[PDB]
Design a protein around this ligand. Structure first.
Ligand SMILES: [Mg+2]
Ligand SMILES: [Mg+2]
Lengths: 240, 241, 250, 235, 244, 243, 111, 231, 195
């Protein structure tokens, strides 16, 4: 087996392979998550350097880890599949031994743990992936949104964004999200999510994806149809 | 230019480490020669004991591999002994597995295949030696098969190895172009040894005492090396010209 | 701590070249010319036996090798690499085919195995590619006669006729002129001897030329009778004499 | 490159020294050890106002009688804490007793130097391990990724540590009460933190022989910040 | 030690790219263009070969189009040898699924495992990635007809029409131009050739430099036939569409 | 260049520079000799006294292998010990299978092949010692000297370390002026002298003499240390000849 | 068939006082109807004010006592010369015995 | 220069720079002294605090009842080597019912250090040790150096400014070698020797560490209030 | 543990599974569900050695649930039964084989037809109109052979089962403390909450 230490310290006290893994995330298509008062919404930019795509069969950018937790990501698509697979296996393993589905914090801590392990293991590079992990703990209606990054650090967010032009939309949400007043309705939270993407996303076309997770394993994704109805509506609210 | 340090190709499709291993071959500054009789194969190598503190009997580049196979080495002694021990192990194992004595040309191929591996795998360095195997094979008669660091091997009518190899080769080439046969047309191994030492003296243009030579003889069912006295006897007969 | 080389010694350069495969092909280019021709009722592979010394007995060093009773191989490039590849090619024909199906592998299947061994030297840790290109000529009941070329990359292509090594460019032009899809084997042997004269500088006779056919079955070469469905090997190396016989009507 | 386990001509391990630079970049952590208990305090340092500050876990329980504060690459501490907890719980199973704070620390510190061509690099995190045992009472230990650990009456680690440590050198005496130490940690944190110390961007904890290791709730700390600001207005 | 001679195939650039993946993609861009077009009633795979000598054996050959099972085929762009390693893996992986579930493998699951292998070579093992891109043309009874591509990175995506190899920028524009969803197989066949005709790097686009395959609904209804065109059938479909 | 940075790399000359660099560490070491005698061998070595804080008699450098073999070496001491430990494993394993204790030529090749093996890979360093060893087998006495390359021969006498040239020349004298044979007790005195003569080059510090011998008549074919009385006799003989 | 166990007889007796404890055993070692020794002690001072006897099969008995005595030694080394509590010793011995659950020490242990 | 990349590389002069760099970490280490009569062997070690709020790095480790060592340099390496030595002492005790010869402890330590200096991806130990022990041939003192060089001495010192103590002991040789039957006089001589290696700061209660082993003395460590008697 | 039955009717599969759990001399429990839901439209009942049955059933359940998440798709009952057979056929040449017999009752949503699979611990699978494991078959197969018709309603199936359970309660020596009945149809899995 290949032994080489690829993630090592530099004289300034930085681990360049981790920091370069973040550069891969920076380049990744934008992803955003927003806590409602009793929902979480995951929004995802999808680049339009290519049409003639088949979107029935192309990997969707939000993945179910269990029936009550979802995971979106920014960065290397191939790398994300490995993290998703491990997380889905760990979720079934947790159910099998603890006789309870994972808490979002636990599933996050697991994925974060995998990401970290690759930052101090021989013969592996870190994951070029940051993740948003969103859902509801079992028999709990308080929503959960966590972020992980190639270093393996993870934390909870009222709302957060990752990938290209995420500094733009983090500035938007910082400005447009009251913690004292979270988006009370589903529609309200979905709206704020689309709005933040429209700072960055070009057109409303098949450029945006929204997935909405409600409590008790109530996960459904919106079709262009129903997102267009927000894109149409927010456009006609710019008339000041 | 790290393609010069390990056995990977240079841009002109060359393995420099294999080429440099050939240069180590001549580092001992010894010349060896091998010819075939009707009944025998004779190997002769120069014996140089520079230091007086050396026990001259322990200084040898000829090895008795098996009952039937003898091997002479052109190259440094540590690589020579490494190669010898291996061929001894390989010839013993072959006998145990397949129920008959390992032929000269098969051991040569086997040792050449081992040499080939060092030219392809990076962590193994080639051995800086050329291995001249001699026997009287039970199927093929008197045999000379020779191996180099490149993993190349071929059978020889006769052969020479060392710095002065080219002079010894053309000398032997000329004898065979003339005599017009595969071998030294001689009855006794004693007279094929005499032939070998003679054509070594002519090609090198130098004279040998009994301690300047090392001789090995392969016959049917035993390969043996001559003592100082068996050579001295043989040198004395060469005097009658 | 012996083998630390568990990483590829063949990697992609910024231009997308695989340096060590290109260099292995360069090593083949320097190699002595070898060629193969498909006739309608046989295949011929041939090469020059360039001697290192006149004291070398060049019948001992065989460049054309039997792989199965119906498959032969020849090469240009590094002889030692060819030797160990023939050994692995013969064994893989048994371990991963004959020991399973009780019959020898068809030409393209055995070629596929040889190619696979050469591809692994192109990717596996701590090894250089093989410095040879093989021409593998063989017959199998359900494909008839065929000829394949295997390169250091592990790529293989089927040929009507081709050559490799030194004077391949020259010879490939010669073969194009003279090849038709109605050649009887004897005609292809003759053409192969003409094509090989061009590239051979020194002596050109039965002792400096190695030539084998994949032709008719040879009961005389089988070694036993009593089984009516074992008719013997289609691979036959032409003798020193048999080559010189044809160099008359040249 | 060069070996991962190689010495500088000075006679120090490059990869250990470079990890020490990573720890200096980390958020501040302070421990003060008193005869009434040991106090651990950390700067949380939320990187944005949107991230929920109480999800930042830089003080962590090891056993009921041992706590841990960290500074540096905090993801690197997952496995150090895991090992420490396992070591503490394991020792209890084998000996039906609490495991000495020094023995715990030594166990954690054995991990630190098991790296090179075992993990690929040293840890990018220093730990303040603070606990109580019957034999040596209240203890604070500083566990570096060099494999060395020092016992401290008080110690600061992270970006604020050079100033904070000289500040602790002044104010620490052998007769500090717990309440004094709690305030003193709040004081020195507020003094070195970039942003302004409140009960959301800083966190407290202590370990008493009586009630073991407790992380203070935001409400409890908020009232100690009031008590601190009031106190410094006087004189 | 040996560290000296290690390229480190599985590291990031300071920009967070994988040097060896990028250089493998550069390698593939000099390979014969392969095109996949998915119709309503089938899929077309068209592959353009490299310059070929007269002596090269025309008919009994398939360097670009390989069968994975009865319902799935791939078009290759890159090193043929690297592709055959990955193909035999995929063929086995398809047979394992069949033995386990007594059902033909869904096209995506096969595509994912191959992509996950490629991914592995980019993250661990210190070996060079596979210098191969695949166009997967396959049918299953969940999504019907599916077109995919996978590249050395381990990334894979779904397509209505796609090209890999040389002049894919040029080819992707021509396909984006003349492709529509209702399009039938025989239209897609014609588009595939027209596209290679315009993007080829030699003047004549003759039958002898083309490999061609279709996966059709056409059979005894409900079942799927997979056709790797004989050279005479490529000569016919080239005369029929009036390119010769 | 770059040819000298990795062990087991051939230079364009055909040399392994790392083995040649190993030899420099040997030459840098204290002097050590072997004198082969009538029915045995004698080993002597120069032990530099850094300080009177060295306990005399107590930092032994000559090592026994099996019962019947003496080993002494110049250069990196740890490397020498590691090679003897290997020699001991080799001799134990030979005795175990073949019952007879290992012959000296057989034993020499065991060290020869092992040391040579550390010139085959870039992942190991060559041995920083030349080893003079030997003893009495069923075919009489053997003296051997082995170098970092794995090169070894049988010797009449041999020397290595700083004082290798003086010793070398002083051995050459004995080979000429005693052609028929040197006795065991003779070689012990002669060994003491040559170490004193070769101390010329390590003139800086004064030293402690250490002799061992393996004689068929005098030690019964076993390796024993020359202690107490017969040591002081040979020390005295040597003091007399540097006057 | 090889029987790895034997029975060396003997009898041991532990009584706890208010501020003392006795651990007694006969000094006779037997196999079948033979006496091996009339004085072979099987009650040992393991250090840290602890006495131990493993009665039954003397080989397993001596193996266990020896292992526990070593356990005391390493407790000192690893926990800064801390005195091993009788309860801590008891628990340690459980793990020694249960370590061979599927090839037991054929001994009755009293400390 | 180019030849200090790792331990498997010789310099053209024939040196192992990685070993010399390891040797260097010892001289940065706080001074420790060893000396012994015919009846006792003493270690005095000057301990180094990190700052005014820190403990004093313990420099003396017990290996058996009859053996133990003091360290200068990387303390984790001293832990590994002391722990290895404990096992060898323990092995000799369990298998052969035999207290391990101090001279053999030397050979095992030497042979362990050597393995780390000859093969790829390793690193020399970055610590020097002084090993005292009363065995079956009297009192012993050993100086271990991570090159693998182990030497039996009457006295010595290693670490920062250790040259001072080392010359005092070189002078006082005949005084201390005949402190037989007196434990305190043999320690006093050691505390005087270690004082030749001080500057600015000198021996307080909790910066000084003394170990003694001998004829009727189990290897024991004296710290804090139990060294005040010697300041 | 003891008796497990299955019958496929017009458009559902009915699994009846004994409620008794006996540890030697005592009936420890009289309300045990010898069933796991593998997917929303697939139910497995199991009987055999203690511990292995729950361990095997839960292990299959986790594997099928993992597949569902990964592909966002429910495997056909045929595919699940083929997977389960392979696991058992795997385990029979293990060091310690799973000692578990199973009935897999599933509604194939893609084919709108109910399917019942009987697999023993050897990995011997058959698709059956009605199935049982162990001694259950010997009593009930005569009743089912007679009364069974491929086009029966669910309530007809339950009535034929009621007869089967009655004959068992009459002639079985062991008191199996009645059965828990479950129905698998196009709308999923539900429990007939008394018998
Ligand atoms: Mg090599
Ligand atoms: Mg059955």
């Amino acid at each position: 087996g290949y032994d080489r230490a690829l993630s090592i310290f530099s004289p300034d006290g930085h681990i360049f392979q981790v920091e370069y893994a973040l550069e891969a995330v920076k380049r990744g298509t934008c992803a955003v998550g927003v806590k409602g008062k009793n929902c979480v919404v995951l929004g995802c930019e999808r680049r339009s350097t290519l049409k003639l795509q088949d979107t029935r069969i192309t990997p969707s950018k939000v993945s179910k880890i269990d029936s009550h937790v979802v995971l979106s990501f920014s960065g290397l698509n191939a790398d994300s599949r490995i993290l998703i697979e491990k997380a889905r296996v760990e979720a079934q393993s947790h159910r099998l031994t603890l006789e309870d589905p994972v808490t979002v914090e636990y599933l996050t801590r697991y994925v974060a743990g995998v990401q970290q392990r690759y930052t101090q293991s021989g013969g592996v590079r870190p994951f070029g992936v940051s993740t948003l992990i969103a859902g509801f703990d079992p028999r709990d209606d308080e929503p959960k949104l966590y972020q992980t990054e190639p270093s393996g650090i993870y934390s909870s967010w009222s709302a957060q964004t990752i990938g290209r032009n995420s500094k733009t939309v983090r500035e938007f949400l910082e400005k447009n999200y009251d913690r004292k007043e979270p988006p009370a309705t589903v529609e309200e939270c979905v709206k704020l999510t689309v709005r933040s993407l429209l700072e960055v996303v070009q057109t409303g076309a098949k450029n945006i994806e929204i997935t909405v997770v409600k409590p008790d394993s109530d996960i459904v994704a919106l079709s262009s149809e129903e997102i267009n109805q927000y894109v149409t509506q927010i456009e006609q609210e710019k008339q000041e | 230019g790290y393609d010069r340090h390990i056995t990977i190709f240079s841009p002109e499709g060359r393995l420099y480490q294999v080429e440099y291993a050939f240069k180590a071959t001549n580092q001992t500054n010894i010349n060896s020669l091998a010819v075939r009789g009707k009944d025998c194969t004779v190997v002769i190598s120069q014996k140089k004991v520079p230091d007086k503190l050396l026990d001259p009997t322990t200084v040898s580049y000829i090895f008795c591999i098996s009952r039937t196979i003898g091997m002479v080495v052109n190259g440094p002694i540590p690589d020579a002994r490494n190669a010898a021990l291996r061929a001894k192990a390989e010839a013993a194992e072959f006998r145990y597995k397949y129920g008959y004595d390992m032929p000269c040309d098969v051991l040569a191929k086997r040792m050449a295949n081992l040499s080939q591996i060092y030219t392809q795998r990076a962590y193994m360095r080639p051995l800086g030696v050329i291995l001249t195997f001699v026997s009287v094979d039970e199927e093929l008669g008197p045999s000379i098969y020779k191996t180099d660091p490149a993993g190349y091997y071929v059978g020889y009518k006769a052969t020479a190895t060392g710095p002065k190899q080219q002079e010894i080769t053309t000398n032997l080439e000329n004898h065979f172009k003339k005599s017009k046969i595969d071998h030294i047309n001689e009855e006794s191994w004693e007279k094929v040894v005499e032939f070998a030492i003679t054509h070594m003296i002519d090609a090198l243009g130098t004279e040998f005492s009994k301690n300047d030579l090392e001789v090995g003889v392969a016959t049917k069912d035993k390969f043996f090396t001559l003592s100082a006295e068996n050579i001295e006897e043989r040198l004395v007969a060469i005097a009658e010209q | 701590m012996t083998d630390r080389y568990s990483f590829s010694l063949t990697t992609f350069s910024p231009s997308g070249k695989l340096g060590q495969i290109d260099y292995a092909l360069t090593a083949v280019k320097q190699g002595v010319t070898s060629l193969g021709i498909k006739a309608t009722n046989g295949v011929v592979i041939a090469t020059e036996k360039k001697s290192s010394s006149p004291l070398a007995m060049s019948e001992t060093l065989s460049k054309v090798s039997l792989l199965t009773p119906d498959i032969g191989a020849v090469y240009s490039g590094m002889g030692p690499d060819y030797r160990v590849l023939v050994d692995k090619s013969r064994k893989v024909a048994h371990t991963s085919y004959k020991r399973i199906y009780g019959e020898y592998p068809p030409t393209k299947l055995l070629v596929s195995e040889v190619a696979k061994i050469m591809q692994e030297a192109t990717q596996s840790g701590g090894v250089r590619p093989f410095g040879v290109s093989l021409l593998i000529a063989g017959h199998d009941e359900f494909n008839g006669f065929s000829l394949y070329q295997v390169d250091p990359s592990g790529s293989y292509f089927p040929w009507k006729a081709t050559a490799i090594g030194k004077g391949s460019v020259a010879a490939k032009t010669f073969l194009e002129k003279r090849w038709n899809d109605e050649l009887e084997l004897e005609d292809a042997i003759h053409i192969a001897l003409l094509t090989l004269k061009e590239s051979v500088e020194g002596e050109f006779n039965g002792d400096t030329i190695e030539l084998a056919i994949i032709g008719d079955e040879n009961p005389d070469l089988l070694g036993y009778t009593g089984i009516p469905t074992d008719k013997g090997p289609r691979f036959r190396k032409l003798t020193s004499q048999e080559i010189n016989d044809r160099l008359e009507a040249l | 490159d060069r070996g991962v386990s190689t010495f500088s001509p000075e006679g120090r391990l490059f990869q250990v020294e470079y990890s020490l630079e990573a720890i200096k970049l980390g958020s501040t952590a302070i421990g003060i050890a008193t005869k009434e208990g040991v106090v651990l305090g950390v700067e949380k340092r939320a990187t944005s106002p949107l991230l929920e500050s109480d999800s930042i876990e830089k003080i962590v329980e090891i056993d009921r009688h041992i706590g841990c504060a960290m500074s540096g690459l905090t993801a690197d501490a997952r496995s150090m804490i895991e090992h420490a907890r396992t070591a503490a719980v394991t020792h209890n199973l084998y000996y039906d007793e609490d495991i000495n704070v020094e023995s715990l620390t030594q166990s954690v510190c054995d991990l630190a130097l098991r790296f090179g061509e075992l993990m690929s690099r040293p840890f990018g995190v220093a730990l303040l391990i603070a606990g109580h045992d019957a034999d040596d009472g209240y203890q604070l230990f500083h566990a570096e990724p060099s494999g060395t650990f020092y016992r401290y009456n008080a110690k600061a680690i992270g970006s604020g540590s050079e100033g904070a440590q000289a500040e602790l050198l002044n104010e620490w005496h052998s007769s500090l009460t717990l309440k004094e130490a709690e305030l003193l940690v709040l004081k020195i944190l507020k003094q070195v933190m970039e942003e302004k110390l409140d009960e959301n961007n800083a966190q407290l904890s202590c370990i008493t022989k009586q009630d073991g290791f407790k992380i203070y709730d935001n409400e409890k700390t908020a009232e100690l910040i009031k008590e601190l600001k009031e106190k410094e207005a006087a004189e | 030690g040996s560290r000296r001679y290690d390229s480190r195939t599985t590291i990031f650039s300071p920009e967070g790219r994988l040097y060896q993946v990028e250089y493998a993609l550069e390698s593939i861009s000099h390979a014969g263009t392969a095109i996949g077009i998915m119709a309503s009633d089938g899929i077309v795979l068209a592959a353009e070969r490299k310059v070929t000598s007269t002596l090269l054996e025309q008919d009994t050959s398939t360097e670009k189009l390989y069968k994975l099972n009865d319902k799935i085929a791939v078009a290759v762009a890159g090193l043929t040898a690297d592709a055959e390693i990955l193909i035999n893996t995929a063929r086995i992986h398809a047979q394992n699924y069949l033995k386990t579930y007594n059902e033909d493998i869904p096209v995506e699951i096969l595509v994912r495992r191959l992509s996950d292998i490629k991914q592995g070579y980019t993250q661990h093992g210190g070996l060079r990635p596979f210098g191969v891109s695949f166009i997967y043309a396959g049918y299953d009874d969940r999504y019907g007809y599916q077109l995919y591509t996978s590249n050395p990175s381990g990334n894979y995506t779904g397509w209505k029409a796609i090209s890999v190899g040389a002049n894919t920028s040029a080819a992707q524009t021509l396909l984006q131009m003349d492709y529509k969803d209702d399009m039938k197989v025989d239209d897609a066949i014609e588009l595939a050739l027209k596209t290679l005709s315009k993007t080829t790097d030699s003047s004549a686009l003759t039958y002898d430099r083309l490999e061609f395959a279709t996966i059709r609904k056409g059979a005894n209804d409900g079942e799927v036939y997979q056709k790797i065109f004989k050279p005479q059938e490529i000569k016919d479909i080239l005369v029929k569409t009036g390119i010769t | 260049t770059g040819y000298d940075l990795s062990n087991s790399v051939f230079s364009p000359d055909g040399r392994n520079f790392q083995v040649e660099y190993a030899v420099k560490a040997v030459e840098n070491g204290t002097t050590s000799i072997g004198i082969k005698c009538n029915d045995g061998v004698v080993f002597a070595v120069e032990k530099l006294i850094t300080s009177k804080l060295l306990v005399p008699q107590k930092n032994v450098k000559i090592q026994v292998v099996d019962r019947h073999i003496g080993c002494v070496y110049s250069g990196l001491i740890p490397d020498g010990r590691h090679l003897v430990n290997r020699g001991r494993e080799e001799a134990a394993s030979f005795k175990k299978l073949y019952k007879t204790p290992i012959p000296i030529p057989a034993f020499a090749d065991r060290l020869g092949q092992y040391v040579q093996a550390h010139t085959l890979y870039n992942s190991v360093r060559p041995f920083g010692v030349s080893t003079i060893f030997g003893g009495v087998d069923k075919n009489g006495a053997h003296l051997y000297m082995l170098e970092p390359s794995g090169s070894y021969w049988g010797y009449k006498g041999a020397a290595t370390g700083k004082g290798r040239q003086s010793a070398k020349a002083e051995l050459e004298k004995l080979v000429d002026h005693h052609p028929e044979g040197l006795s065991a007790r003779e070689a012990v005195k002669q060994a003491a002298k040559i170490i004193y003569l070769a101390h010329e080059d390590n003139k800086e510090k004064d030293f402690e003499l250490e002799i061992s011998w393996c004689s068929l008549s005098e030690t019964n074919g076993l390796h024993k240390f020359v202690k107490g009385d017969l040591l002081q006799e040979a020390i005295d003989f040597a003091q007399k000849e540097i006057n | 068939q090889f029987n790895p166990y034997g029975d060396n007889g003997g009898t041991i007796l532990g009584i706890a006082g208010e501020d003392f404890a006795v651990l007694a055993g006969d000094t006779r070692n037997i196999t079948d109807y033979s006496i091996n020794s009339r004085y072979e002690p099987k009650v040992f001072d393991c250090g840290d004010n602890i006495v131990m006897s493993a009665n039954g099969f003397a080989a397993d008995g001596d193996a266990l006592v020896k292992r526990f005595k070593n356990s005391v030694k390493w407790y000192h080394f690893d926990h800064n010369d801390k005195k091993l509590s009788i309860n801590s010793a008891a628990r340690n011995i459980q793990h020694l015995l249960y370590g061979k659950r599927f090839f037991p020490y054929y001994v009755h242990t009293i400390i | 220069n180019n030849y200090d990349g790792d331990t498997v590389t010789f310099s053209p002069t024939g040196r192992l720079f990685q070993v010399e760099y390891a040797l260097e970490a010892i001289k940065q280490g706080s001074v420790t002294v060893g000396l012994r009569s015919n009846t006792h062997a003493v270690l005095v070690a000057l301990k180094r605090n990190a700052d005014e709020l820190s403990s004093y790095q313990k420099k003396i480790i017990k290996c058996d009842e009859h053996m133990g060592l003091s360290l200068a340099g990387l303390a984790p390496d001293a832990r590994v080597l002391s722990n290895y030595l404990r096992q060898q002492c323990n092995y000799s005790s369990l298998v052969f019912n035999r207290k391990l010869a101090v001279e053999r402890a030397g050979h095992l330590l030497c042979d362990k250090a050597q393995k780390n200096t000859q093969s790829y991806g390793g690193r020399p130990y970055g610590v020097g040790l002084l090993i005292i022990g009363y065995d079956k041939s009297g009192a012993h003192l050993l100086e271990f150096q991570p090159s693998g060089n182990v030497t039996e001495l009457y006295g010595t010192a290693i670490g920062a400014r250790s040259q001072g103590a080392k010359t005092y002991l070189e002078r006082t040789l005949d005084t201390f070698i005949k402190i037989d039957g007196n434990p305190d006089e043999l320690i006093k001589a050691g505390v005087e020797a270690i004082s030749q290696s001080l500057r600015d700061e000198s021996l307080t209660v909790d910066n000084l560490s003394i170990a003694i082993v001998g004829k009727d003395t189990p290897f024991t460590i004296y710290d804090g209030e139990a060294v005040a008697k010697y300041i | 543990m003891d008796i497990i039955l299955g019958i496929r009717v017009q458009d559902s599969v009915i699994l009846a599974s004994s409620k008794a759990v006996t540890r030697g001399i005592s009936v420890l429990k009289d309300s045990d569900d010898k069933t796991r839901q593998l997917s929303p439209h697939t139910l497995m009942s199991f009987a055999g050695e203690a511990g292995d049955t729950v361990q095997f059933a839960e292990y299959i359940q986790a594997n099928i649930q993992l597949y569902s998440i990964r592909e966002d798709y429910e495997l056909s009952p045929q595919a699940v039964s083929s997977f389960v057979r392979q696991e058992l056929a795997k385990s029979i040449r293990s060091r310690r084989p799973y000692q578990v017999n199973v009935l897999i009752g599933g509604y194939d949503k893609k084919k709108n037809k109910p399917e019942l699979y009987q697999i023993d611990y050897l990995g011997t699978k058959v698709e059956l109109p009605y199935g049982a494991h162990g001694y259950s078959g010997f009593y009930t197969f005569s009743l089912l052979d007679h009364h069974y018709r491929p086009d029966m309603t669910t309530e007809e199936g339950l009535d034929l089962l009621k007869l089967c359970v009655q004959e068992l309660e009459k002639r079985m020596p062991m008191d199996f403390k009645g059965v828990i009945v479950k129905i698998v149809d196009k709308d999923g899995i539900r429990q007939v909450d008394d018998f």
